[PDB]
Symmetry: C3
Subunit: 271 residues, 3 copies
Amino acid sequence: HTLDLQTTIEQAWENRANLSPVDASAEVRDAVEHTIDGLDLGRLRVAEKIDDQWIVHQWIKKAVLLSFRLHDNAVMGQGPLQFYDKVPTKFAGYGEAAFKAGGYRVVPPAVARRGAFIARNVVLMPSYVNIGAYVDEGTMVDTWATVGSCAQIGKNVHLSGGVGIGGVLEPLQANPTIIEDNCFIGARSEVVEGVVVEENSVLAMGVFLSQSTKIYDRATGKVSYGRVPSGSVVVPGSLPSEDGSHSLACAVIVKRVDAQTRAKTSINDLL
Amino acid sequence: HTLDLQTTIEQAWENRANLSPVDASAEVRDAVEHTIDGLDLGRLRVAEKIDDQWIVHQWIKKAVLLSFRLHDNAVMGQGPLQFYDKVPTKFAGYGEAAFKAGGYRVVPPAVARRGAFIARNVVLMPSYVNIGAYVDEGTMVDTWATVGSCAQIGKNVHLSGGVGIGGVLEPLQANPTIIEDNCFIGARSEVVEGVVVEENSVLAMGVFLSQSTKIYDRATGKVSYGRVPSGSVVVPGSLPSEDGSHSLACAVIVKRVDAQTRAKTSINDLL
Amino acid sequence: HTLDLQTTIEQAWENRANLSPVDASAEVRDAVEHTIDGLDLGRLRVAEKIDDQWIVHQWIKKAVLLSFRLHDNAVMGQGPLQFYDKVPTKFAGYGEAAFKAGGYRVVPPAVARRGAFIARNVVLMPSYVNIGAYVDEGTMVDTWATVGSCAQIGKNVHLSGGVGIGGVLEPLQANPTIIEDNCFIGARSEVVEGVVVEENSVLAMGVFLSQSTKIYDRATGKVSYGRVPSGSVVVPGSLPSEDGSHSLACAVIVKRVDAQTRAKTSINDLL
Ligand SMILES: [Ca+2]
Ligand SMILES: [Ca+2]
Ligand SMILES: [Ca+2]
Ligand SMILES: [Ca+2]
Ligand SMILES: [Ca+2]
Ligand SMILES: [Ca+2]
Ligand SMILES: [Ca+2]
Ligand SMILES: [Ca+2]
Ligand SMILES: [Ca+2]
Ligand SMILES: [Cl-]
Ligand SMILES: [Cl-]
Ligand SMILES: [Cl-]
Ligand SMILES: [Cl-]
Ligand SMILES: [Cl-]
Ligand SMILES: [Cl-]
Ligand SMILES: [Cl-]
Ligand SMILES: [Cl-]
Ligand SMILES: [Cl-]
C-alpha cells in the first residue's frame, strides 16, 4: 500500500533506465502490480470523461510501460500452441467462479491481456483485447476484432467483424482511441490514433479513421478531422482534386440521427 | 426421435421465455440437439436452393437460437488460453478416425463451432466458422477469414485472407449470406446481410457488400443492390454526387465471364 | 548430407506423382527436411536480393511443396482447440532455452509454421506467419496480421493490425511479395502477388496492392503497377472514367521522402 501510488510510479519512471526484471524493488513492483490490478478490475482507467471532456492519466500509462520493463518473457501454453511473452493473459487460472463473477463470455480462441477491463454482458467473439483497454457493459466484440492498448469502448457498442480500434500508449500525453456509448462500427473499419467517435454514431463497413483522415460533412460541405460528432452516419467516400485528375479517399457523414432514431431503426435500416 | 421435429422446435420457440439451462425438458433438449447434430453433419442446412431460388428454414434458426438458451457457459481450455462459452467447438474430442472421416484440414489456430458443416477437401487456414454455416466441398478458407452464422458457401470457393461472410440468424425470415459455387472473394472483402454472390463471380480485394451497397454495372450504367450476377468481376469504385463535390464508394462490375473463361484464366489474369 | 541438395530436390519434384507419405525414400525425406530446416533457421531463403534485384530460388519452393506431399495430416492440440494438419508449427517442443536463443516474442495466440524464419527482436502479436516467410530483425507484426508463404519482410518493418502480405508459392517462377527495410504498412492494408514495396515507404490504412492495382503518382500524373518506389507515401484514392460517370479505386503516391525524413518524422506526422 504505497503512501502515494502516483508518485511512486512517477519516480520509478524517472529511474526506468535502472529498472529490469532482476533489479526492481518490491516497492516498485508492488506499485506497478497494484496499478495493473486496478486496470484489470476497472477501478482505474487510462482515460475518463470529466466535465464532458476526455482526460488521460499519464501516470497509468507509465505503469503499463513499466510492467513490460519489469517482467521477463516466459514460455506459455503447450502442444502446437506454444508462446513466449512477458504479459500475462487475463483469464489465466480462472475457474467457473471467476468467470461467473465477471459476467462476460469469452468465445474460443479469444484472448485478452491482464490489465484490460471487460464489463458484464460483454461478448468476446474470437478477438483480442490489449492491456489498458476498457470495454464497458453490453458491448459486442465480433470475430477478429481488436481493442488496442488503452482504448475506451463505451456501453452497448457493437464492434463488427475485423474492426480494429488502435492502441495509444506513447506519446504519454496522447488520449487513447475512444468509441462512446451505443456506437455501431461496421465490419473491417479501423479507428486509430485517438480519434473520438461520439455516442450513437454508425460507421459503415470499410471506414478508416486516423487523425489525418478528412471527415467530409455532406450536408454542410465542410471538412474536419479527428472526431465523429454524436449520431453521425459515416460511409467511405472521396474528394476530388482541384484539377479533376483523381480523388483521395475520405470519410463522409451522410446524415445525423438522435438517440430516439437509433432505438427505433435497425442498423441495416439506417441505410 | 420426435414425432415431428419441426413442430417440437416451433412449440419450444413459443415457450422460450420459460426455457433455461435448468428447466428444459428432455424432449426439447433432444429435439434441439438432434437439429444441431443434423446441421453439423450437413444433413440439415439453414438455407438451400430449390427451383433456382434460395429458401430459408426458419425452424432451424429457431433451434440454433434455442441451443444458446438451453446451455450455460462453461470453462473451456487451459493455460494461457482459457475460455468461457456456451457453444461447443466442432472438433472437441475428435481423434484421427473422426478427422480422417471428415476429409478436411484444420490449420492451427482455426476454430469452428459445433453445428457448422465442413465438407470434404476443405482447408481451414486460421479462421472461424460459426454455428449454422455450411462450407461445401473443395473450398479454401484463408487466414483470418470468417464464415458467419448460417452462411452458405458453395463448392470450390476461395475465401481469401481476412474475408468476412456475415452471419444472419435474426431476423428469422431473412436469408443468410450466400457465396455460390466457384466464386473467388479477394482479400479483406466483406459480404454481409444476406447478399447473394452468384456462381463463378470474382470479387477483388476490398469489396464490401451489404444490402445497401450500390452495385454499379459499368457496361450498362445501371445501379442495383443485394446480388452479384453470375460470372461478374467486381472491384471497388465510387459514384459522384450530382454537384461534383464528392463521391461515395460503391462496388463496380467491370466485366462478366462464363464458366469456360474461369477454367482457362487465372484469378490473377482475370484482371 | 545430399551430394547436391538442389539436384535431389529437383529430381524428386520430377518424380512427385510417385511420392506419398508412405512411399517416400529416406534420401528425399532428408533432403526436404534439411531444406525446411534451413528455411526455419534463415540459412536458406526463398528469395534474396542480389545485384539490387530480387531473385527467386525455385528449387526451394519445390522443397516446400514436397514437404506437403510427404506428410500426412495429424491431430494436434487438445481440449476446445483440436486441429488436424500436415505442417508442424514452428515452436512445438520449444522451451525457454530455444525461445531465448531466437530473440523474438510470440504473443498468444500467435502461430507460425515450421519453415518460417523469425529474426531477433521481432514481436509477433496475435498473427500468422506461413511456411517459407522470412521476417527480419526488429520487425513488428501486429494483431491479426498475416505474413504469407514465401514473403520477404525486411528489417524494422511495421506491419500494422490486420495487414496481410500475400503468399506466392505457385507459380514456381514468381517472386514472392516483398516488403523492404523500414516500411510502415498501415492497418488493414494488403500487399499480394509479388508486389514489391521498396525501402522506407509508408502505406496508409486501407491500401490494397496486387499486380493489377493502378499506382497513380500525383506529382507526375503517371500510372504504374507492381512496385512502390522507395520512400513513397501511398494512400487510397481513385481515378475517374473518361465520361465522368464513376471512378475506380487505386493507390495514390502523394509524396516521396528520404531516409533522413523517416528518422525525424513520426508516421503519424508524415501525414
Ligand atoms: Ca526501485
Ligand atoms: Ca498467462
Ligand atoms: Ca475461479
Ligand atoms: Ca419443455
Ligand atoms: Ca467444446
Ligand atoms: Ca476419433
Ligand atoms: Ca524417392
Ligand atoms: Ca506441431
Ligand atoms: Ca528449449
Ligand atoms: Cl505487474
Ligand atoms: Cl473529448
Ligand atoms: Cl489531391
Ligand atoms: Cl444442443
Ligand atoms: Cl436466390
Ligand atoms: Cl452523395
Ligand atoms: Cl520436412
Ligand atoms: Cl526487384
Ligand atoms: Cl472505368
